Every structure is written in C-alpha cells, then in structure tokens.
Design a protein around this ligand. Structure first.
Ligand code: HEM
Ligand code: HEM
Ligand code: LT1
Lengths: 145, 145
C-alpha cells in the first residue's frame, strides 16, 4: 500500500530528508549525473533500459543524459515539497510510478537506486542514517510499482 | 535552432520571468490545476489527449489531474532555474519536447498553452508584458517541436 508506505515518513525521517536535500539538491546537474553514472557503473544490467539516452558512458558530455539527470532531480524536489501533505505526495508518486511501469521497471529494480543514493550521500558526508531515510522515500515509489 | 531561441532570451525577459514565477510558482498545486482547467475550458478539443487522467472536470478532486498539474509546474521550475545557462536550458527543453513529440503534439498545439498562462498571470495582476515574456519561453519549446 502506497498509503501505508507514506505513513512511514515520520517527523524524524522527514527532517533527515530535508536536511540532506538542502545539500544534495543544491547541485542538481552535478549530483544528478553522479547518481546516474553510479547506477550504470554498479548495475550494468540496467543500462539497456536507457537506450534513448545513447552512450551513457560519456556522462556529463552526453546532452540527453544531462537533461534526463537534471529532470530526475526535480522529481525528487517535487517529493520533498509534498512531504507535508500525504495525499499530494501520493498522487505525484503515482504519476512517476506510471512513467516507470510503462518502461517495465519493477519495484525490485527501482530499488537498485538505493546503492547510488547511499554512495553520493556518503561523498557529501551523509552516512547510513540519511541513506536509510531516503530508502524509506524510495519505498513509497516501490509500493506503487 | 532551439539554442538560438534560448540564447535570445534577454536580461529583461529573464527578469520578468523570474519575478512572475516567484508568485505563480509559489502555489504549484493551485496554479497548476488552474492552468490545466483553463486549457480544457478554452480549448475543449485538447481534452481527448488527456484520457489517462480520467474525468478532468473533477478538477482538484481528481488525483491523477492533480499529480500531473503539480509535476507540470516543476517542469516550469526547471526551465526558470536554467535560464542563465542556455546549454542546460536546451537539454531540459529537448527532454520535455520528446515527451510531447511522442504524443503527437505539434508546435502549434503546444502554443495553445499561451492563453491559459496569460489568464493565470492576469489573476495575479501580471499584465501583457509578462505574458509576452512567457510566450518567448514557450517559443523555445516550440523550436524543438
Ligand atoms: C530516485 C529514483 C528515480 C526517480 C525519482 C526517477 C525519475 C525519473 C524521471 C523523472 C524520468 C522521466 C520520465 C519520462 O519523461 O518519461 C525517468 C525515466 C526513466 N527511468 Fe527513472 N527514476 C528513478 C529511478 C529509476 C531506476 C532505478 C530505473 C531503472 C532500474 C529507472 C528507469 C527509468 C527509465 C528506463 C526511464 C526512461 C528514460 C528515457 O527513455 O527517457 N528509473 N525516471
Ligand atoms: C507550459 C507548457 C507545457 C508544459 C511545461 C508541459 C509539461 C508536461 C509534463 C511534465 C508532462 C508529463 C510527461 C510524461 O510524464 O510523460 C506532460 C504530459 C503531456 N502533455 Fe504537456 N506540457 C505543456 C503543454 C502541453 C500542451 C499545450 C499540450 C496539448 C496541446 C500538452 C499535452 C500533453 C499530453 C497529451 C501529455 C500526456 C499526459 C498523460 O497521459 O500523462 N502539454 N506535459
Ligand atoms: Cl540529500 C538526498 C540526495 C538524493 C540524491 C540525489 C542525487 C544524487 C544522489 C543522491
């Protein structure tokens, strides 16, 4: 249940999401591309899904990848801004869930993003505490897939 | 090219865009739904393109329409944040252009959004000068369609 998952975002979890987002969300192009390049490097088996982006190994030099990466960061910004209202968080999560269901992405494969998130968070000095908070938000999307 | 359309956005135009977005972008849910409902009211021929959203006459109560509307406002947020770097603006514009090209939305049809934008701006007392500024931004997307 996406609603039961959203209910897991307690006061402490929301605070950790906001505090860390203030830092990682300040450089959407840089951190967005880092997130994607890490996903492709650590989980090569997912590259096939991103055929439209061309050669993803080019990273920042790939215009399609950069555009995709920046936009992905705005999806996260959207989620963060909706934390106050669970009904609005759910309707935006379901909107993005559809974007992935049409791409044949399962809850299990969507969860492969947790590794990259933990890694980039770690590079900014945000440990497991924060990685786990983000895993809870990702879990809301997983519940809708 | 799209780059030409973007690179032409002047300091004054960017100023008007940012000043007006400070206001209309502050209530993404309210203004996002207002934009969509106005599009459907004045251009009923476009309703068919949004069948995935269900009964759009439901307005705010329609969770799919609400989720779509909020997300659309973040696409605009994305554009506004990239104004000072044409290279970044171009790659995000091309990304969203693909989302509409796949739906067979022509440059002319995409331009139908100018009417609704002008009305929403006017509701907050932003006149023709501002509507013209936004038409120039919409024109950047049209250059990609
Ligand atoms: C924090 C997690 C993630 C977020 C917020 C997210 C967000 C997005 C957004 C905003 C889009 C563009 C939607 C569209 O325009 O159709 C997208 C596209 C896509 N995503 Fe994700 N995504 C995430 C994780 C993943 C993961 C882990 C996979 C794969 C295992 C995945 C696979 C895809 C694919 C295949 C596309 C289509 C790319 C294209 O052809 O343009 N996403 N995602
Ligand atoms: C300010 C201009 C506009 C912006 C920023 C915008 C933004 C968006 C975004 C972000 C999406 C979701 C893309 C996806 O997830 O696949 C979308 C979908 C769509 N847009 Fe637009 N759009 C604009 C104008 C228009 C206009 C004027 C039309 C029609 C004449 C249009 C038709 C569509 C359609 C048919 C969809 C698919 C809806 C669905 O089935 O989910 N858009 N738009
Ligand atoms: Cl503070 C939350 C950071 C989420 C994230 C976004 C992009 C890349 C890595 C992590």
């Amino acid at each position: 249940s996406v609603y039961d998952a959203a209910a897991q975002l307690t006061a402490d979890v929301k605070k950790d999401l906001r505090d860390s987002w203030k830092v990682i969300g300040s450089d959407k192009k840089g951190n967005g591309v880092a997130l994607m390049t890490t996903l492709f490097a650590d989980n090569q088996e997912t590259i096939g899904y991103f055929k439209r982006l061309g050669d993803v190994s080019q990273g920042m030099a790939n215009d399609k990848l950069r555009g995709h990466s920046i936009t992905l960061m705005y999806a996260l910004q959207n989620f963060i801004d909706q934390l106050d209202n669970p009904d609005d968080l759910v309707c935006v999560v379901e909107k993005f869930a559809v974007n992935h269901i049409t791409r044949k992405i399962s809850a299990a494969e969507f969860g492969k993003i947790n590794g990259p998130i933990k890694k980039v968070l770690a590079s900014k000095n945000f440990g497991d505490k924060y990685a786990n908070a983000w895993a809870k938000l990702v879990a809301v999307v997983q519940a809708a897939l």
